[PDB]
Design a protein around this nucleic acid. Sequence first.
RNA 1: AAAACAGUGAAAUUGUGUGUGGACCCGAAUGGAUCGGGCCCGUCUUGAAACACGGACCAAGGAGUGCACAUACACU
Lengths: 165, 111, 154, 135
Amino acid sequence: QRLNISNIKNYYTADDIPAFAEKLLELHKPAPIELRTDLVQGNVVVVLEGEYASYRVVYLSRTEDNKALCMGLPSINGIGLFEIDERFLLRTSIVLDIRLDKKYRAKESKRSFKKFNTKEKVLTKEENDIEELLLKEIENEKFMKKYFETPYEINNTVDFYEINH
Amino acid sequence: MEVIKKIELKERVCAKGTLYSHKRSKKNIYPRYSLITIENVKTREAAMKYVGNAVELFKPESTKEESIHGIIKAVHGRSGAVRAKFSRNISPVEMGSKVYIKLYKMNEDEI
Amino acid sequence: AHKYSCDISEATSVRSQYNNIKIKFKNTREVCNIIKTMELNKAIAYLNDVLRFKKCIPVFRFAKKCGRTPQAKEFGTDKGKWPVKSVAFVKKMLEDLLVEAEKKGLGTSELVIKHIQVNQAPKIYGRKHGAFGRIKPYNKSPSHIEVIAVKREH
Amino acid sequence: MDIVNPSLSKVIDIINKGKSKKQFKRFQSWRVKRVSESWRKPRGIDNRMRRKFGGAPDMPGIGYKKPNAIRFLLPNGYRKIMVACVKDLEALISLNSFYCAEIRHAVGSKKRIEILERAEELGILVINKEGKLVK
RNA sequence: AAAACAGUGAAAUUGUGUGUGGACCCGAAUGGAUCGGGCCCGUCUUGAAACACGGACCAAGGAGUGCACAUACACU
Ligand SMILES: [K+]
Ligand SMILES: [K+]
Ligand SMILES: [K+]
Ligand SMILES: [K+]
Ligand SMILES: [K+]
Ligand SMILES: [K+]
Ligand SMILES: [K+]
Ligand SMILES: [K+]
Ligand SMILES: [K+]
Ligand SMILES: [Mg+2]
Ligand SMILES: [Mg+2]
Ligand SMILES: [Mg+2]
Ligand SMILES: [Mg+2]
Ligand SMILES: [Mg+2]
Ligand SMILES: [Mg+2]
């Protein structure tokens, strides 16, 4: 054999490396995250992250593992239809009686954002439809219309876990 | 101005705390972990309810990265302080600064 | 040929250099330091005042145990000096560049001293006799010089 | 050059980010210019580094040696072999899964062209491919 | 005593320009004040940071070798 290989190449039997590669890949694989149970169709929730944080919205469905689908009220608070990680929602005990016909999908609300969407607002037939459903449940009720307009504010004088929602 | 808005958004939704030390003995420091106090939490039993929650350090004057994320790992002592871990080690210049506690849990891998 | 210590265009500049000159190194760099970035006509006017004891050269690096003087206040220090032999040489050198400027077809005005540097040349050896039958060194320390002046863009 | 060994493609970044950047400078090489940076073990009777006081630097030793599988691996996921002839590449024909070639510095332009042409048809990666032959 | 090529042209050391710091090393970082640990090496000595000695700075040179005579081990 030629002298370059009889010396340098000798360091390692490299045919073994695939077995190492598998074991390493396994170890640095992510842990699983649990899908929650506590949310029911038509629950009001408060948004905790991203461009829409602080507003009340209504939960519609599970979508794609941890992803969930929500609607604001384009007339009442200007928020349309969007998707978000189901952990970025705070639950509250109010439940509206809405039921929907079919599945729908929308843009995700990422945690890191650069700029606000002050303009360029339009609506689809389904956005119109779903608003014109939600609105019926809201109109008949005393202060509910105004409730959706004021942002949420955490109490700065007591421990959070003492409060109920 | 986006900074003024990003602050008000965070202020309305998070609990507040301050960074005060690294984990240390009398002689040595362990800068991978930091110690935090939370506003109205004052016993170890009260503090246990925050273990697992996300934390964020926001710094608008920074040229590199506007915020650092982390997680609360454990309670520390008997008067309601906690220990946390971040995606990068906290500088001694950043001690005394304000930290935000985010009201949802995350996994140790996400940071 | 000579490789000048920095890169400036041949058009819009004038140059000179000399080697092994027999003016004293440490005195010469204190002179050069103060006339850097100055306009050429201002430089020639200032150096005329130094020869007449009306203004001084301030000292900053080669300056230990030097005398204090009211003329140094013009540059925010107390310490100054009058090194006549170095001043006469630099003045002649600068005056020749105005001849070159005029002959080359630039103006005699708007020329600014953009680069100037002094380097040590090799020592010339000498001796003095001491007590108890000893002999000690008594050497001389000459210098090399470069200047480049350029026309202001204004 | 932006190439990777296909068997390690989904792992190479973990490997690279895991390599140490520690240096073992000789003691007091920072104090006098006559002592170079190259490691020598201290052997003085009083010496603070040999005696392992806290605050002195660390010394080399077997504990720092890398795992046998990762060792010698370039950041593209291959091991290297030196070549200087066309007849050298002929050796790699069985090993091209894990090894790549690096042409020796002293091989000149006219000859390098002949090496690269052969490398293309045999299917061997050459890491100095651009080399002097950019002009 | 010194002194080879009218080759190549390192380090100590100097000037100018541009950057970073106030003796410096190790660990960990920031947009930014810095935090924690470390006394000067070599050597004789019960014991050295020492009010023990040698060391201003850089290059090059610089110290268990050869033969004879018995010997134990390994190899033919
Ligand atoms: K000096
Ligand atoms: K290294
Ligand atoms: K000792
Ligand atoms: K090891
Ligand atoms: K020569
Ligand atoms: K030469
Ligand atoms: K001694
Ligand atoms: K003493
Ligand atoms: K002695
Ligand atoms: Mg005096
Ligand atoms: Mg005398
Ligand atoms: Mg006599
Ligand atoms: Mg004694
Ligand atoms: Mg001495
Ligand atoms: Mg030597």
